[PDB]
Design a protein around this motif. Structure first.
Motif, PDB file in Angstrom:
ATOM      1  N   UNK A  10       0.918  -1.141  -0.001  1.00  0.00           N
ATOM      2  CA  UNK A  10       0.098   0.201  -0.150  1.00  0.00           C
ATOM      3  C   UNK A  10       0.967   1.412   0.133  1.00  0.00           C
ATOM      4  N   UNK A  11       2.250   1.290   0.552  1.00  0.00           N
ATOM      5  CA  UNK A  11       3.063   2.523   0.570  1.00  0.00           C
ATOM      6  C   UNK A  11       3.506   2.551  -0.829  1.00  0.00           C
ATOM      7  N   UNK A  12       4.135   1.467  -1.444  1.00  0.00           N
ATOM      8  CA  UNK A  12       4.691   1.825  -2.755  1.00  0.00           C
ATOM      9  C   UNK A  12       3.690   2.587  -3.655  1.00  0.00           C
ATOM     10  N   UNK A  13       2.530   2.171  -3.659  1.00  0.00           N
ATOM     11  CA  UNK A  13       1.523   2.726  -4.301  1.00  0.00           C
ATOM     12  C   UNK A  13       1.555   4.285  -4.602  1.00  0.00           C
ATOM     13  N   UNK A  14       1.084   4.933  -3.148  1.00  0.00           N
ATOM     14  CA  UNK A  14       1.220   6.478  -3.017  1.00  0.00           C
ATOM     15  C   UNK A  14       2.589   6.837  -3.724  1.00  0.00           C
ATOM     16  N   UNK A  15       3.603   6.026  -3.733  1.00  0.00           N
ATOM     17  CA  UNK A  15       4.618   6.498  -4.427  1.00  0.00           C
ATOM     18  C   UNK A  15       4.713   6.448  -6.083  1.00  0.00           C
ATOM     19  N   UNK A  16       4.305   5.613  -6.562  1.00  0.00           N
ATOM     20  CA  UNK A  16       4.061   5.042  -8.091  1.00  0.00           C
ATOM     21  C   UNK A  16       2.869   6.213  -8.535  1.00  0.00           C
ATOM     22  N   UNK A  17       1.801   6.288  -7.637  1.00  0.00           N
ATOM     23  CA  UNK A  17       0.846   7.254  -7.981  1.00  0.00           C
ATOM     24  C   UNK A  17       1.361   8.614  -8.112  1.00  0.00           C
ATOM     25  N   UNK A  18       2.112   8.889  -7.340  1.00  0.00           N
ATOM     26  CA  UNK A  18       2.420  10.315  -7.188  1.00  0.00           C
ATOM     27  C   UNK A  18       2.898  10.925  -8.601  1.00  0.00           C
ATOM     28  N   UNK A  19       3.421  10.184  -8.958  1.00  0.00           N
ATOM     29  CA  UNK A  19       4.154  10.349 -10.364  1.00  0.00           C
ATOM     30  C   UNK A  19       2.900  10.938 -11.513  1.00  0.00           C
ATOM     31  N   UNK A  21       0.019   7.995 -11.799  1.00  0.00           N
ATOM     32  CA  UNK A  21      -0.712   6.794 -12.334  1.00  0.00           C
ATOM     33  C   UNK A  21      -2.147   6.458 -11.669  1.00  0.00           C
ATOM     34  N   UNK A  22      -3.039   5.983 -12.377  1.00  0.00           N
ATOM     35  CA  UNK A  22      -4.328   5.592 -11.914  1.00  0.00           C
ATOM     36  C   UNK A  22      -4.215   4.845 -10.699  1.00  0.00           C
ATOM     37  N   UNK A  44       5.019  -2.488 -16.718  1.00  0.00           N
ATOM     38  CA  UNK A  44       3.807  -3.474 -17.303  1.00  0.00           C
ATOM     39  C   UNK A  44       2.871  -2.964 -17.959  1.00  0.00           C
ATOM     40  N   UNK A  45       2.362  -1.833 -17.503  1.00  0.00           N
ATOM     41  CA  UNK A  45       1.165  -0.991 -17.910  1.00  0.00           C
ATOM     42  C   UNK A  45       1.535  -0.550 -19.401  1.00  0.00           C
ATOM     43  N   UNK A  46       2.763  -0.077 -19.739  1.00  0.00           N
ATOM     44  CA  UNK A  46       3.300   0.344 -20.794  1.00  0.00           C
ATOM     45  C   UNK A  46       3.376  -1.091 -21.841  1.00  0.00           C
ATOM     46  N   UNK A  47       3.758  -2.121 -21.402  1.00  0.00           N
ATOM     47  CA  UNK A  47       4.207  -3.178 -22.281  1.00  0.00           C
ATOM     48  C   UNK A  47       2.885  -3.688 -23.080  1.00  0.00           C
ATOM     49  N   UNK A  48       1.833  -3.522 -22.593  1.00  0.00           N
ATOM     50  CA  UNK A  48       0.584  -3.819 -23.287  1.00  0.00           C
ATOM     51  C   UNK A  48       0.429  -2.929 -24.624  1.00  0.00           C
TER      52      UNK A  48
END
Length: 54
Positions: A10-19, A21-22, A44-48
């Motif tokens: 749940x922590x890593x999220x707030x980080x990636x999202x900060x940039x 991301x949904x 991973x999201x871009x990979x698609x």
């Protein structure tokens, strides 16, 4: 967590999202990859698909 932590960070999220991301999306990837790294998810999201990245 405790007694067997089952779930992304749940922590890593707030980080990636900060940039920029949904919230509902970030999670999905985060889990798929396995809380590997903030970049891992975004990648991973871009990979698609995503002709625009950087």
């Amino acid at each position: 967590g405790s007694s067997g932590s089952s779930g992304v960070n749940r922590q890593m999220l707030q980080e990636l999202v900060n940039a920029g991301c949904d919230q509902e999306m970030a999670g999905r990837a985060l889990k798929q990859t396995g809380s590997r790294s903030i970049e891992a998810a975004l990648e991973y999201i871009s990979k698609m698909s995503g002709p625009s990245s950087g």
